[PDB]
């Protein structure tokens, strides 16, 4: 099966700048007879269905603005947005219809570039209402940061935590172009009362050194 | 291996409908 | 005016079967191929197969042979995707797409897509969430503000709606996407950044509504003593 490689997976762009996206196929897409490349480009916005932009590697679908351009031949293909608009933020994936099974690329996600913003860290001990139920959830909140790359590390009595925390990230804010992250450490009540100090350490580009928020269980 | 039943019947059916 | 209309979301238990429909309109149903594409949440597109609606003959991705069955009803201009022996891996969005038929060839782009059908496979029963406070503190200040929130834990299925002060509180709110826990139940958090000086005079209430279980919870979040 043909493998479609798209690099990079994510790209931070500025409104008005020229954007370029790469698509590489493991097998050649150029049919020798008609000298046509069986390559298509699609746009998919969050929650919506894919939308066709370019086919035959370079032919623009009807209605697609002229700022979208496809290029390349054989194995190397390229999608270019001459002057990116705000409404252009979406995932762009390539597709070969040259040989069954048809295969798609993983896509390139377009995001808005922004100056670095350090996160605001808040730690929340488990409520007393949940502790009666038999479980304890510690929540670490990382608020309004950029870029999205961020490392959250749970430390319980300085012991590193692994495999017992779930993470969640918001979509890029349409106003200040920042992200927000929420990490939840889940322990049983018996395990939660085994230790005292609970902390989440936050590593981010906007921080000179890792910022740590912590609390001691039972204290205020 | 252009010998493919899906590919061949597709063309024949298209001729039958055309 | 070409339109591919797909059926609604399916909540099914593992090991069962599901049948997704794709109703075409605005063109001759049998003059275009119907493609089926699978997309798992936050992943790349996966081509399942294709059917010639006029001749009835399908062509399958080898990975889906035995799991996917493609049919087409010319009388209703409707294409069907049948999935058997459903598991957690089959939980995805299933798009139906349309591809032209020029010169009797099928090697063509996909020019029109349906809205997609969400299929969720789970053995969990319907259950209302538990709403726990994430209490703010005038001593816990980062970035110039305080932070409070609500932990919405252990509910099934999606979705849950979370508002603050019955919708009056809109600025500074972050409602995170739900994560699926190993118990089969969902969980998420909604947080707000608030002024640390107003915690004694401003009230904050998170309104959690779960329509599938008819759960309506209003929880007041206040500083601890």
Author numbering:
A (entry chain L): 1 to 220
B (entry chain P): 668 to 685
C (entry chain H): 1 to 225
Tell me, in the authors' exact words, what the paper reports.
Here, using structural analyses, we provide evidence to explain why a vaccine targeting the membrane-proximal external region (MPER) of HIV-1 elicits antibodies with human bnAb-like paratopes paradoxically unable to bind HIV-1. Two rmAbs, 235 and 460, were further selected for structural studies using X-ray crystallography. The former recognizes a MPER-C helix epitope while the latter recognizes an epitope in the MPER-N helix. Here, we demonstrate through structural analyses that the approach angles of the vaccine-elicited MPER Abs are poorly suited to access the MPER crawlspace on the virion surface.
